[PDB]
Amino acid sequence: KEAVNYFNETGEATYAIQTGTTEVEVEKAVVNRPTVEMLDPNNVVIDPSCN
């Protein structure tokens, strides 16, 4: 997988050997969904100038 990623990044066919392991952060977004919610007309105050 890392070999394929390197080939896509640079372009040199290269195989890999595991030396060790690092410890990275990674800001995963657990929830990434849109929200469509029906709102109450008592809650929205739209500008009355919009002719």
Binding site: A29, N32, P34, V36
Partner: protein, 145 residues
């Protein structure tokens, strides 16, 4: 009797007597009688609302979902959409889909296959039949075809 007379006189003065969304076929679109065109007049506003919601979500999807999430949902290659032109919806059209729309689209694809079936090569016809199979909810036949 006076109410009836006044109603008839008004209806004679103004010839207005009291008394299927999408790329639908001709029969369903022509079957609309009175008050059906009035129900469609509200269904179209409701559909415009849903279309606006859909395009708002589609615009948000281009900047919030990473590559991996989309390549996992669709299992196909990720297509990048330039962020600068995201405020125009240039090359994407969105509208709600109903059963009648699906049926008419399948019939249109069948008609296209019938028309260009011997002139063009096999790839175009096979792709059209694969789209027909996708409309029929057979995602495996689409890949096999």
């Amino acid at each position: 009797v006076m109410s009836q007379m006044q109603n008839q006189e008004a209806e004679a003065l103004t010839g207005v007597k009291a008394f299927a969304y999408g790329d639908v076929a001709a029969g369903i679109r022509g079957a609309l009688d009175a008050a059906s065109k009035r129900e469609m007049a509200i269904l179209r506003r409701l559909a415009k609302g849903m279309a606006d919601i859909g395009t708002k979500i589609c615009a948000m999807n281009a900047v919030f979902l990473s590559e991996t999430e989309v390549v996992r949902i669709t299992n196909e290659e990720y297509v990048t959409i330039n962020r600068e032109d995201l405020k125009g919806n240039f090359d994407i059209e969105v509208d709600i889909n109903t059963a009648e729309v699906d049926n008419q689209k399948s019939q249109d694809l069948g008609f296209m296959v019938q028309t260009i079936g011997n002139t063009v090569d096999q790839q175009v016809t096979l792709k059209l039949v694969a789209r027909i199979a996708e409309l029929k909810r057979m995602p495996e036949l689409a890949h096999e075809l």
